[PDB]
């Protein structure tokens, strides 16, 4: 083939991922084979084709797409570590706040770009945020969820995490607005600051109830229309809202204000990526070099 395996990077949502070298250019890449349940779906065709052109410095670059033997191989730029591993590596000391702020600022730039082209991620999580040794962070697998769907289990039966999923998806609404990615990024922001996942649910109802226990059980006052969501139940227990001061210490008041806006229940109220970039939390943002 055009690409020689270097080693297995891991299992992805849709198939195995290898670090590979392009024979002709000598470039090293992450090669994702997409295994689906007849030919590639025309939905997958339309979506993947848009992704080759959706280029930004905070989006992992899709270098090429090979479609052969009725299967897709997506060839991505290679980055050496993900945020999940970097957070685990930093658990004793935590990621320094100026670096958290830089990462959040760059991720919001990537989101602002994709959202302005009407593309969303829908499955943001620390595993698909990739970092280099210079200070950049990039969104991986952008757009793959609309192209292929989000499965309950991966092809190797691993459970797809619910910890970053927005409440409107958990309540069964099948319209995903760009707000779903702001929610996930807010959860990741809180996790970087506190060194603990914010809502580590292990089932859809456990995920919802963890959200409710922190933010209050939603009602029509805070989220007009919530009681019309397909999976809303009037019998959900009523929990009161906790103050964010207890949820993300030692984050400052600007950071807590930004977080609360990214975690509004109503997707119509939730801050957009563009507005979030103008928030005073980023007034003193810098681009540090990480240790790793
Ligand atoms: C999943 C569809 C959706 O966008 N919905 C569902 C209900 N909803 C809403 O306002 O419904 C009426 C009260 C107008 C019937 C709502 C509200 C906020 C966000 C998303 C939705």
UniProtKB/Swiss-Prot annotation:
Coiled coil: none annotated. Residues 3-282 form the Protein kinase domain. Pfam families: Pkinase. The modification Phosphothreonine is found at residues 13, 156. Mg(2+) binds at residues 128, 141. The modification Phosphotyrosine is found at residues 14, 18. It catalyses: L-seryl-[protein] + ATP = O-phospho-L-seryl-[protein] + ADP + H(+); L-threonyl-[protein] + ATP = O-phospho-L-threonyl-[protein] + ADP + H(+). Phosphorylated at Thr-156 by CDK7 in a CAK complex. Phosphorylation at Thr-156 promotes kinase activity, whereas phosphorylation at Tyr-14 by WEE1 reduces slightly kinase activity. Phosphorylated on Thr-13 and Tyr-14 during S and G2 phases before being dephosphorylated by CDC25A. Its EC number is 2.7.11.22. The gene is CDK2. ATP binds at residues 9-17, 32, 77-79, 82, 125-128, 141. Changing residue 13 to A: 2-fold increase in activity. It comes from Homo sapiens. This is Cyclin-dependent kinase 2. PROSITE patterns: PROTEIN_KINASE_ATP (PS00107), PROTEIN_KINASE_DOM (PS50011), PROTEIN_KINASE_ST (PS00108). Keywords: Acetylation, ATP-binding, Cell cycle, Cell division, Cytoplasm, Cytoskeleton, DNA damage, DNA repair, Endosome, Kinase, Magnesium, Meiosis, Metal-binding, Mitosis, Nucleotide-binding, Nucleus, Phosphoprotein, S-nitrosylation, Serine/threonine-protein kinase, Transferase. Induction: Induced transiently by TGFB1 at an early phase of TGFB1-mediated apoptosis. Changing residue 8 to F: Reduced phosphorylation by CAK. Belongs to the protein kinase superfamily. CMGC Ser/Thr protein kinase family. CDC2/CDKX subfamily. The record marks 8, 84-85, 162 as: CDK7 binding. Phosphorylation at Thr-13 or Tyr-14 inactivates the enzyme, while phosphorylation at Thr-156 activates it. GO terms for molecular function: ATP binding; cyclin binding; cyclin-dependent protein kinase activity; cyclin-dependent protein serine/threonine kinase activity; magnesium ion binding; protein domain specific binding; protein serine kinase activity; protein serine/threonine kinase activity.
């Amino acid at each position: 083939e055009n690409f020689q395996k270097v080693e297995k990077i891991g299992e992805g949502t849709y198939g195995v991922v290898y670090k590979a070298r392009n024979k002709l250019t000598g470039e090293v890449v992450a090669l994702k084979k997409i295994r689906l349940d007849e030919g590639v779906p025309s939905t997958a065709i339309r979506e993947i084709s848009l992704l080759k052109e959706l280029n930004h410095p905070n989006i992992v670059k899709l270098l090429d797409v090979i479609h052969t033997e009725n299967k897709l191989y997506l060839v991505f730029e290679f980055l050496h570590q993900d945020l999940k591993k970097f957070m685990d590596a930093s658990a004793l000391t935590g990621i320094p706040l100026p670096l958290i702020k830089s990462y959040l600022f760059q991720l919001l730039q990537g989101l602002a770009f994709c959202h302005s082209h009407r593309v969303l991620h829908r499955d943001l999580k620390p595993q698909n945020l990739l970092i280099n040794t210079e200070g950049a962070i990039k969104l991986a697998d952008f757009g793959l969820a609309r192209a292929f769907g989000v499965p309950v289990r991966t092809y190797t039966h691993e459970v797809v995490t619910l910890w970053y999923r927005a409440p409107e998806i958990l309540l069964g609404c099948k319209y995903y607005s760009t707000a779903v990615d702001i929610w996930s990024l807010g959860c990741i922001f809180a996790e970087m600051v506190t060194r603990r996942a914010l809502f580590p649910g292990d089932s859809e109802i456990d995920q919802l109830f963890r959200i409710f226990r922190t933010l209050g059980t939603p009602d029509e006052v805070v989220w007009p229309g919530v009681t019309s969501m397909p999976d809303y139940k009037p019998s959900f227990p009523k929990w009161a809202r906790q103050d964010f001061s207890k949820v993300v210490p030692p984050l400052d008041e600007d950071g807590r204000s930004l977080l609360s806006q990214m975690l509004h229940y109503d997707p119509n109220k939730r801050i957009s990526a563009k507005a979030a970039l103008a928030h005073p939390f980023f007034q003193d943002v810098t681009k540090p070099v990480p240790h790793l």
